[PDB]
Amino acid sequence: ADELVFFVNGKKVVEKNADPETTLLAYLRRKLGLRGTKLGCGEGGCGACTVMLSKYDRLQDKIIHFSANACLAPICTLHHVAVTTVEGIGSTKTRLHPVQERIAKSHGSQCGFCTPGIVMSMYTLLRNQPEPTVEEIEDAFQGNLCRCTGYRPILQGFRTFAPSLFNPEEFMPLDPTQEPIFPPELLRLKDVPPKQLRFEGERVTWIQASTLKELLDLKAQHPEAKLVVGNTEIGIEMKFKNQLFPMIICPAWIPELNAVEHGPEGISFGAACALSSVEKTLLEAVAKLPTQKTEVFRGVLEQLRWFAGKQVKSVASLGGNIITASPISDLNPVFMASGTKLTIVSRGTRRTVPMDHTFFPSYRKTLLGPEEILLSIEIPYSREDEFFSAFKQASRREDDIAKVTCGMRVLFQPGSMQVKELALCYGGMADRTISALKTTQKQLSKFWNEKLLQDVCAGLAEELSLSPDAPGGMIEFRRTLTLSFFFKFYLTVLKKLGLDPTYTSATLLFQKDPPANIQLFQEVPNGQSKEDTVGRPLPHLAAAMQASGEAVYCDDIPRYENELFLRLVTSTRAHAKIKSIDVSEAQKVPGFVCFLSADDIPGSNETGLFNDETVFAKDTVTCVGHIIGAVVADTPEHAERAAHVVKVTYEDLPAIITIEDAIKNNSFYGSELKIEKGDLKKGFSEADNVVSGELYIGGQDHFYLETHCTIAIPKGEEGEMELFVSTQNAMKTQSFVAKMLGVPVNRILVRVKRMGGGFGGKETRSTLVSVAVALAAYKTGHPVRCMLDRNEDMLITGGRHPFLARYKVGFMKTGTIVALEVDHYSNAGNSRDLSHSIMERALFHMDNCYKIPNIRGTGRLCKTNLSSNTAFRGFGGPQALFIAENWMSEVAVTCGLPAEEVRWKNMYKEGDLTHFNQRLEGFSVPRCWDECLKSSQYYARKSEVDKFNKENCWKKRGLCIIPTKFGISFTVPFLNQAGALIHVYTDGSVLVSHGGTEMGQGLHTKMVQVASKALKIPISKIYISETSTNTVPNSSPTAASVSTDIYGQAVYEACQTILKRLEPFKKKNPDGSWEDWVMAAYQDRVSLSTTGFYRTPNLGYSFETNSGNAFHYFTYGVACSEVEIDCLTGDHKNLRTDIVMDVGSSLNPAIDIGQVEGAFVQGLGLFTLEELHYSPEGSLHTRGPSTYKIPAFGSIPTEFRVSLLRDCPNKKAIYASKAVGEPPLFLGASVFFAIKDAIRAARAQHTNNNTKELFRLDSPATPEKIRNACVDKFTTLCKPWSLRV
Template sequence: MSEEDRLEAFTTTKLLNPQSTGYLQREKVFDEKLQEVMKPEEYPADITLNTFIREYAKLFGTKFYCLEGGCSCCTVTVRTHHPVSNKYYSRAANSCLVLLNICHGWDIVTIEGLGDRRSGYHPLQERLAQFNGTQCGYCSPGMIMNMFSLLEASGGKVSAEEIENSFGGNLCRCTGYRPILETMKSFASDCDYEFVEKECDIEDLRLCSKIGQICDRKCSIPKIAKVDDQRVWYHPRSLSEIFQIFEDIHERRYTLIAGGTAHGVYRRDPNIEVFIEVNNVTELHSYKIGDVVELGANVTLTGMMRVLKEAAARPGFEYFEETLRHLDLVASVQIRNFGTIAGNLMTKHDHNGFVSDIFTILLSIDARIVVANPSSQVERSLIEFFKSDMRHRIIVKIILPQWNKSTTLYGSYKILPRAQHAHALVNAGFHFTFSGSQINSSRIAFGGINPNFTESHATVEFFEGRNLFDPDTFTQSLEILGAELQPDWILPAASPEFRRRLALGLFYKFLIKNAPEGLVKVTYRSGGHLLQRPVSSGTQYFDTNKKEWPPQEFMLLSRKLIPSEALAMPGVIAFYSAKDIPGTNSFVAVGLLYLYENEELFCADIVKYHSQPVGIILAKSNELAKLASTRVRILYAHNKTGQEIKSTVKDVVDHKHIIEYNEETACGGMNSAGMKKSEGILIKPKRIRGYFEMGGQFHFSIETQTTVSIPREDGLLLYSATQWMDLVQASITNALNIPDNRIEVEVRRLGGSFGCKISRSNHVAVACALASWLSNRPVRFVQSIESNMRTSGKRIACISNYTLSVDEQGRIQSYTLNFYEDSGVTKNESPVEGYTIPAVPNCYQRTASWIISGNDVLTDAPSHSWCRAPGTLEGISMTENVMEHVAWAVKMDPVDVRLNNIPEASDVKGLLVDFIKDADYRLRRKDIDIFNAENRWRKRGIGVSLMRFPISYEMQMSAAVAIYHYDGTVLISHGGVEMGQGINTKAAQVAAYTFEIPLQMVSVSASNTFSGANSIFTGGSIGSETVCFGVQKACNELLTRMKPVRDKMGSPTWLQLVQRCYEEHVNLFSQQIHHAGDLEPYDTWGMSCTEIGDTGESLSPLIDVGQIEGGFVQGLGYWLMEKLVYDRQTGELTTFNSWEYHVPGAKDIPIDFRVKLFQKRPNRGGFLGSKTTGELGICLSISALFALRHALNSARKDVGIDEWYHLGAPTTIEDIVLAAGHTKRDFKLNI
């Protein structure tokens, strides 16, 4: 299909070629003529579009992960009519939130509909590959469909800034976003890249034979539909029909459905009996701009923004510009496309703790709401609505007032844990009207304080008749407002003190922004402005309140499981628990590398951590299995052991309860007097003490743990998302008590991993195999994000304390480091001795006076696991933090301290000198210090970090190469696993290079435990090198066998040579392995420079290239936002989904990201002179933390604080606010 034909298919209602897939037309979704093919009653009432696309339409290109609209890998394009204009328009949708029963009359395009290798790829697909915008590829369909929707909705005319702003809902863990954004921005109308536009003629539609107008497909929408589970869907077309439905259903539990996006925040009640779709009620979709602006309740948030943008140009509505800026921070494009104003307000109404930006905005601008009952319509304030009973009542419209611009001040704010697509930590809206200089009326609204506090009353009353900018009024108002702000604390919310300070800070920001020019001190003025982020670019050169948290005794034992209610549900097959396991109740094979003890597959007695699995439910669908799992009753017994719950290493260290201990000690030191000679003068060294805390980190691979198990005649075939096939095989052997050779494991590729699929994937794999073996059925197990986060181990957290002595130049004389790493319930995968301790010296001069002690700590949490650069990140970071502390103590530039501690003979010293020169570090630091001195409330900072990443090859990896005689093509199979690092591409390139044949003649099969038998896990950044080494050995072995034939033939072509070898019975298959000693260990060096601030050149690292950008951005998440919060009473992880656990988004990446490869420095010990890069970026990302410290140092100095303070991982917005040391006494106008 040509591009022109494809675009035409997507912009009209013409049928695609019957062989095409991925295009679900309106005629195919509940058309009356096709009722016999697709009947609504055949599907569950709450089935989502994503489930239908994947499980019924069998279009698996559309992915799923969070199932709450938080990642957008499920994005599809929806084309539908507007209920008022009847015009068709396109928009991106989160298919995991859209319910199938609201899709009447929709055209739905999935990734398959854009193109494939048979019909040809869409330019978006091709260009994403050309720009290297895909690694594991799991997020790619959602990225492409979001861009496709944006282009189609805009007729191909969209700016680079609009594009970058539209990807806040799409998450990627691999790439760091830059190549994806570069791909998408190449389609921008203001981009130099060529892009062929095609205007969308959405009027080119058929006329309806019934009404003689453009068909709106309403004829095919049934008014009522009963579904297979006896629940009912209604599709009313007017308000009167809705009220008739209310009368008919009496007291049955119901819900009104428009976009269904609230399900992403608060899960839909599974007991709902009646679903009422309101998308076709015209009265709820209209809008009017006059003396006021009226918005229909079912106007989407995207539609609301469109209307406000239109109205903002009219007198009296200029304040909409401020509102639009705030609305742009609400949710994501996909959610705003379907979420409605009424839906958002009703979510706030039903869940008072919901921090609704829409509610805060509307409250602050004195909006009114019209609510209808069967007999009348009543206009209410937001507060009246908030407190009213809304059963059998409907929000009809929202009325926004017109203001006199000259007598009104308004501002609204939202503070998020990341740049986009996150709920507010605190939001606020401030609205003042004046008579002369006196306040006539005011409204001060907040969200995120506590469920019952939405606006200030005492402060508003105090302001009446006063001058807002009078110094005394200003000071008193802060005191009154501070007393009114009484935040609650329900985990995982930030601390009350932080939220109080933040709320006061937002009010202060509003005041200094709007105060007359002469009333605000020049150095304060910049604090009133919001940071403006330019479009990103890149370059490549090849919980502590212990009074509220009394720890409880660990006292639960699993005594009895009662699955009878679950098993009685139609479609539920079986329930298996620990008693059903034929072999060992463990999902690991003890004795394999870094695995020292068994880990329970299912809890058999004492509950070892919160959410520990007790069994597995089998059902005919994933949704049914999840529902059935909630019906299994678990009876617990109390066992008062006297032990307190300790979910984190900090809990254990605080209680001085160290379970395991490993130590490496180097003896030696200074002379007995503790003095050092320097140029003939005895100088007493400076003593420095400190601690450093690095928390855990969830891997957040967009593909969760998943396995398919298929019974075979004598065993099992598993398709498992694992990095370690050999471990899966051995662990199933152990649990099922069947031989290894009856279990085959196959892996094609992973949707991301970062270490979570080395051993943690085994929990799902072994459980799936058990269920398949016992039931003799094929079983597919896809773990939900909530279950994955609760039951799987995270990055191993680390706490350290250190003592050192330094001279006046910051040179370390002695260094004692004690660190404690969080193992979870077992010490499996401990990195202490193998990774952390060797990484501690980093690039610096280690002497006999360095003493390093490492400890494993057992906690009441799932066994933690390796995560990108395990141990190495922690070891490097501990010493880099020490360098910053030394620099602060001796009052030197941190770069100079580093230079003074690098051995003279090390190449790193010269590289660092060149690096800071290339980065223009000295001048930038000087400019930053000047800027900070001139700005009280806006700060910048710059930081540098160094890295030595040691690589060693201690693992066995197999590779097999087969040459096929008929056409000379080559097939490779190896024991490694493709997970986005390009291992298959590299292996194919090595074979093509060695054989001197075109790359197109080489392919790579799925990895498996036959050709890849006994291979170790793919990880540690060396999988590609070891696989390629094995491939090269196999290729060379084959060339050696073929050489006698070649010599006899002279100069044959490749095909001639292969065919002659076949005729002469030369073995054209070879299997080789890489083993320890084949490749020499080596070090990789790197350095980064990070600048934070508002200058538009926020980051300029010159660092090693590869997967460096993805690792660096993951590191930004680790150091600045990704926080695991545990309930101290129960041990429960409370940040267990994408709503509460925030990884970096597209606008959290560096604005200016530069990567430099130092050329002509081959690694003679590595494979083909290469060096690994997969885990380097995250080790360098700590420079962002140091830049933040530089900025904070200036802020603390401004309030008279000059002492060392702790910044660790993560240093969240809360930590930053509290570390700055500001109180309301520091909020001043002109002092």
């Protein structure tokens, strides 16, 4: 085996024993100790692992810099490459790079786990273009995901490279002359011509071919060998599909596979050319050559706009896309429609063939022999009379798998409209790229006219059939897109041959307006001390360390030399007896230590919030993902491989999957919950109108960028164990670990530094991992750790509850509500967990902001063979609020009244009682509403919307303004308690500890701001290290948005005790410093240590009597959103959102606006993009960012305005502030109701003229739901013997 030689941050790395299966991410994190680069998904979709790669280009005589996903880069591709990580550009220990400084100062970093990946995307752009355009900046992030920030502050901070929350005049200018030089040793090695290399791993041999002759010899000797260039398919096959290719040849060095030739028929690219190189060449060709010659080039470019992101396009090869032959390839349909020419070679042979329908004979096969390789691809010039289109529709515009994707080419007779050639090639409609040959063959010699359109549509409807069991589902949507794509091509070709102006927008390729972002908040009083930071936009205290990669998350903690790795073994069945477990294959995997199951547990196998769960399944499994056991091994890869071959034998039991299955089988957790006020029968009797319906809202996966993880350290004394856990609930982690071990709680120490996201997902479900890792530490006597892969995390740890509602609303012709009944059903899954409390909060929010004198709400928890669902930001609130605004929206349509008038006239007034008899004091919705109407220019924009809808047939705009209120407190009274512990050391430095945990919400920042004000000392003198069960015991989970309120009071009270103890010393030396008083107190033997504690007063609602305070107060806000839908694809733009939020007197307007923007974007995700799909048998299909689409940089409203309400002190909380974590999430529903408005305009246009029709739109309003609701001549093309008269 040869040495692998590369550079990391300017330092030479000589790896004498490269394993070909080693990724750069694993090497950086486990071999080089550089833990700033993160694992977020391992499948190329999140960008947390982004690094910069730099190399000398032979063919260009220059240093090139490009971004890459370290999770998919094999170290064996990196010989003589220079890597730069976040640690290579700057640090708080030296100096931050401008990119680091600006994302931190701009409030672009919350939990911080995505920050290094986004820093390295922005850094790479700046190394290529030191003064980028706003569009280049946004395009940098097509391959980066952030769950916390809602993206706006990251883009606004970085826009500086092309009162106020930040000041750009403070920012250090970028100086490219101060960037680290390309390693001089690497620039010397460019002189030595390349040699074939061989790397030998535990399972795989890797040959780096230097010449074409070597490649063809190797393929003649080893025809089965997999080529690898980018590894962006093979990496997925190896990791996710359990594929092992014992021999790999990498031909990326070969000059013939990298050549770019401009010929008379078109532009030839070597099959190893990166898609980013293709894109750069085709853009230059489109800029230089006449329009009529670049029709196919512009089709390719349109597909490449929506092809993954920069990281994947910089490494993905042409040849890899073509030969992978995925049914959903975005390039193969374009190459097929254009007859792109393929040059194929083997030792002693060569042929050129135009790609056509025969090139792809069956699933994942092409017409290459086993000895052949794709050498080069010639993309053709277009001819006179020859036009081309390419279209892609997915679940999300940016970085998504095609639902349907196409290439379309037409050649006319010279100067005519008479078809000579027609090719319509589609991905996503079969197990391979297909041509609609039957359909197109019937149009040869026909003219481009309405009859050709009708004939092609009817033909595509017959020829591109999908049986009801088609993989991917969405049968009606995919068939519609195939026609809708042809219609767009049809109209585009009419324009190019030369349309009614109402038809023009159907021919426009996607274009966004430039961004416009305004944040309004309140200046602090004129006299406030500069050291009093309460009400100031102080950045998150860890933001700079998050941007530098210095912030330690759980898995970033260095491993002990004797530390082992745990892999969970989970059920593949919804409901079965476990008959046997065989570990005989697992025991053979190198580094295998043990298999653990229920019988290894020394204490109790009973766990969970309601004691209704197993630590490890015994006798029975009750969901796919049900934890049966765990493998422990010496490396994570060995634990994974051994777990995969543990063989479980099952005997299936009857399974209950869905809400409908649970209702039919009477499968519920406990008895009905109910709130009832007034007289429903009389209310319905008084009603002019009654509407009845049903509504469904899909679940949600948290997609915290940091997945669940626990390190368990057994001390070997008295049962003692110390755990480092990504959890919001250190107290339940401690007691659950103790109960499973059968030891007192005082033996178990849980430490939480920070989480890269929690969002409710880590309130309880983190224990599934903690208790398994603790058992492993107990059984082995070694440190053990487990961090979940994304696919495990999505399968096992639960999500937001899906809700089904049956509702009945009685109202007057004026829109006034007089009666309401709503029956709520949640899909709870296979344990209680928090499902009961979530249904209570749903029932407390069924009113939204509306007075309903006669009201009955019920709730049932469905017990099902699905992973147990849990807390998610909003905690049942968002489901019940969505059901409310859905029937409210239907009242306004039924009445023929503007929706804002019907909402306003139903709104509570100051001093009203809710349906649960709580008095609304300081009810600020009316101020938020009037201010949001004014600053959003709602009335003027409603007439602009109507005008656009009259002028546009195939696009429509929608506008909606909705209010919210959110009850602030745990519904479980005893959880409304908070402890702090404060130490003043003899240097006067202060260590604060409280029960709350940091997950990016800026709690420790706010607690430091609170202690600094209370003590009257600068924040610089105060520090919070972590959360731990041996500093503050019996802590509530960091939950219900109340942490600032309750830990703020506990910290405040601990500060007052300290002030009272220093008072005698301050009096005796009034001109002294803090440090003088503290030393004098110490020398007088006064304690500088105290607890603080807070208990929220006057809480305790009863469902039986409908009396007592559920909440301490309500957080309020209003959001107005405008969208444009594409009626032909189901894609939409978020044009503009304006929010006004009442957060009382904000402790920190930067963190509060960041919570409003973040919450709003997670809601936008809930209601419009995020969908989990399950087999009929209960197996989750959607287990990574490739299939589960959270909001991307490009998803946010293009004009995004946030105001915090002025002059609204809240006397019920610390320094007059209000909880902000969860309340703003529901305001994301404004986009859903604007989409519904736009769909009503589409249905007025092409479906029917019933202006009072109520069409059901379930959540989420994905492109499938939007396209299918826009019923037209296309949906119609995509019978019984008798019918009663």
